[PDB]
Write a protein that binds this ligand. Sequence first.
Ligand SMILES: CCCCCCCCCO[C@@H]1O[C@H](CO)[C@@H](O)[C@H](O)[C@H]1O
Ligand SMILES: CCCCCCCCCO[C@@H]1O[C@H](CO)[C@@H](O)[C@H](O)[C@H]1O
Ligand SMILES: CCCCCCCCCO[C@@H]1O[C@H](CO)[C@@H](O)[C@H](O)[C@H]1O
Lengths: 182, 182, 181, 181, 182, 182
Amino acid sequence: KLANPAPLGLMGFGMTTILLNLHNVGYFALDGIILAMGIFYGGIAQIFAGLLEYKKGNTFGLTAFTSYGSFWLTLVAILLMPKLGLTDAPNAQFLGVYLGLWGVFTLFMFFGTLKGARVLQFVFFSLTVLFALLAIGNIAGNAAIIHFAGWIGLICGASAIYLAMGEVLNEQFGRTVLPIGE
Amino acid sequence: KLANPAPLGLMGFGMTTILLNLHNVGYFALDGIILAMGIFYGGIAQIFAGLLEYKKGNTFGLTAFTSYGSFWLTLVAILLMPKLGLTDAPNAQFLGVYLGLWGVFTLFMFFGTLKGARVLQFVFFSLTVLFALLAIGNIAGNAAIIHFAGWIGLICGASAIYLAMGEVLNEQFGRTVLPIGE
Amino acid sequence: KLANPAPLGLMGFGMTTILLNLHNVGYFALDGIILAMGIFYGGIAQIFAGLLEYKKGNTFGLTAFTSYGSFWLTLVAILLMPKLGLTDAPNAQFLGVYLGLWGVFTLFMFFGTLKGARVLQFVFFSLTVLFALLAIGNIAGNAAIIHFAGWIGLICGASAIYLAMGEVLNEQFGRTVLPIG
Amino acid sequence: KLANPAPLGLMGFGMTTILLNLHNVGYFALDGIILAMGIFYGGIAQIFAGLLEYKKGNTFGLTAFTSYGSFWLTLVAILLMPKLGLTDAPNAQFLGVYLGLWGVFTLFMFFGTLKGARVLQFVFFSLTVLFALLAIGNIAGNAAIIHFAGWIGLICGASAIYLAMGEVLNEQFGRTVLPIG
Amino acid sequence: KLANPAPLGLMGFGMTTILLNLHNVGYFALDGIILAMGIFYGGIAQIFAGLLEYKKGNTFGLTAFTSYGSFWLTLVAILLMPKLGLTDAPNAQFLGVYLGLWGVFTLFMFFGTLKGARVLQFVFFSLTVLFALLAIGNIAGNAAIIHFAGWIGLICGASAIYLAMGEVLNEQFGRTVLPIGE
Amino acid sequence: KLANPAPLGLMGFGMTTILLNLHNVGYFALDGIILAMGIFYGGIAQIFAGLLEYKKGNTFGLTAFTSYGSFWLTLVAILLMPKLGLTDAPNAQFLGVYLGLWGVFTLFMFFGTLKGARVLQFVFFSLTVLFALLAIGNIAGNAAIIHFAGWIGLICGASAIYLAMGEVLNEQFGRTVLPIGE
Ligand SMILES: CCCCCCCCCO[C@@H]1O[C@H](CO)[C@@H](O)[C@H](O)[C@H]1O
Ligand SMILES: CCCCCCCCCO[C@@H]1O[C@H](CO)[C@@H](O)[C@H](O)[C@H]1O
Ligand SMILES: CCCCCCCCCO[C@@H]1O[C@H](CO)[C@@H](O)[C@H](O)[C@H]1O
């Protein structure tokens, strides 16, 4: 009877992850498109979804969605505080360690997805791999590893968008029109 | 007992979409009017609508209304972050890829409207079409395709404003005074 | 048991509308008085009223009060985003089309007041005339149309204040001390 | 069972008015002290109080506390948008009309207090007189009326504080330790 | 069943009062440390505590915590609006009259603590003396009274911290580990 | 039935603490990464966690998460109000007293964890040592103590993440997959 906020948070997260990984692949630069999306949709909208998981019983969704929206808000801030002259750019090795800490949080949360749907297990698996590769590629500096991570990132966003659209549509019809792997 | 937030969310979205596409048709430039409406009515007020669907059972309206207010916030942000020297203008091919992803989101969400009224299915069809044409016209650079999508947006906004005003007025009289193609 | 938010929203709307039409009539310039009131009283305070109508059963008041406060916020944003170098001043024609869109919303919402009190039907009719005249007076450029609309706006705002004070004053006494019909 | 939000809103308004009229009486200039208080205590904190009247049954308190908190926000915005290069200075005739609009709102809300406590009736009386004289003194320009209006405001503000500490202290003791109506 | 928000408001108030009075005593200048605390802990967090007293039955705490969180916000604003060129520094005597009004508010609220705990009566007594002395020392120009007010303020802050930790620790253990004076 | 907000608050606190102490250890400078995390994850997200403890019965979690979330926001404000020309950098002895005040708050709240999980007791033990050492290293000026406290801080940050992921994963599986010493 309380709506499911998981699709909103999953859409917010997934769509924004794709755009950032279109840059990481190399097709585009880290644009105001990625930044605006990280502010309002991958951040704010996902924080909303996470807070709405509270009156549902969902500690995982509360812990997950809220944490990743906060991640997108930190990321946009790291990129935009220099353009405001408050902080200097980041150190990519420090940027690498930052992305690594978010990686282990996802690693633990993966074990939390094991009784849930199978698409959900995949988005947490792929997201751990994405963060891992970016942690390596930024600490050592390999542009190649970051290009490979980018392709893993595009898949991650597509999975999360599908899972969200899976949830919303199965609820809408009453039967599982899009397979998820419950 | 809980009010219907859909007319407000539809009004905010619908009115702001008309204004933006009066520019896409070519009659006007991308003004602060579109930006102001995109901030407060197509964005915030629709975000209110999406959040107010939560205590209703409406996962769809929560997912829908909340995401499009966020989109309008991202759009104004992409256009105004350059004026602030935070970001450089954006790649239109990236803008096209951004607008296309929102089209894929609406496309799935249209399939969710299949048991709902007819106008709602129409707004989601034209809105799927709107995002598609603009994404095409922006990746390739066809001013003609963009002038055509502008006309599709004008009808689309008219549909949502009509749907919103239907719902509010059908509720008020107790009989369905405005046809919504239930 | 839940308080009535309509007087707050009507007060915010009405008072803000009077002051803005004191400029549209011509007695004063488009001041920070109008701009402040448009930010906090006709905009924010009315958005509260609209949002407080939600746990009540009131879809009309939710959609109406919330949309008009948002209008006042967009209006102030259109008038103040230039002073900040974010947006060029706006073409009046659009303003007319923008005020015209807000007019059509008000027209439909007028048909929605047909089972409510009488003063409420009047504020929504006169506001429909107000939005309509301004849309015309701005697309065409008639200063005269805008001077007349201002007087329609002063009457509209005074009506919303009167209705608001009716509801609050009728509720307090137990009889309809102010006739609202 | 829900806490009483009137003492907070009364405190926010009352304390802020006292400070502002120490300027209107003439003791001080219109300081940033008044502006800070107008932002956070007579403004935001009272808006909280107004909104907290909603789940209580109190439409009068909702409408009043919420409207005056917004009023204090509009005034600070009117005084500070010039220092920000947004709004030029305000027109004193218009400010008088603006304070006049806020004056009529208080006048009606005064008639709503007729079955309520006695001190509450006084604060709305003095606020009505306060707004009236300031509108008079501002459209007309008598510094003396405004110096006189200020002295009315110090009494108005001191009374609202007195009512607030009454409400809180009478509830706390269970008997009326501080006399109110 | 609702948490007790009083310890949060008492912590914010008390810790911020100590810091400010390390300056009033003379050890330090009115540093940004005092101002940061005044914004977020003595101001914002205490306003949270105050709003949380509403669903409890607690009008005193609602009226108290919410007003003093606002005081700390007005205090920061008085000190930071000149650095923004919005206001010219305050006059003192007006500052003294301002702190004098907060003293009269605190005085009445002291009579309200007479059925509450004994330490609670003390924080309101010493705060009344704190505001009184600072009002005098600022109207009269005595650096000496303002140094004396500083030491009373250090005690006032320490009481609130002890009281807060009594409340939290007594609830946690089930017996009164720290004496308060119920 | 209300989600457990402790993992969110614990994640926010811990992850951000690790990074700030990667600076205290000496590997990195006080980056925009540390500032971004302090704003959104160690600050906002933890205030969220703390406020959600209210409808649960948890006065301790309310007092703790909200106060620390406020701490990161004051610390970010201390580091950023100078970059804006609002305040002058802090005096390190005054910072030391400020961090010491947060230390006594943590010391008392430690006594509040004695019936809780052992890891919970550990995060409060190491956090008390962390504040005490940093308060000492800044009052006296020992860079060495601050290099050592940084190591104690890293351990502390690790615990809070471990406890957070313990809580989430134990609820999710139904058995204690990760030991927390209940
Ligand atoms: C992309 C990272 C942001 C989203 C993090 C994943 C959100 C997972 C929410 O799903 C919910 O998880 C629970 C697990 O059992 C189920 O109770 C519930 O039914 C399922 O719907
Ligand atoms: C103070 C300046 C104007 C701001 C708003 C003041 C409104 C105070 C509301 O009062 C409340 O009204 C109820 C009926 O009116 C009474 O039950 C009660 O006596 C009183 O608690
Ligand atoms: C110094 C400014 C901040 C101080 C504000 C203190 C208000 C706290 C109110 O006390 C709380 O109210 C009841 C009695 O008040 C008790 O039952 C409750 O348990 C107690 O915790």
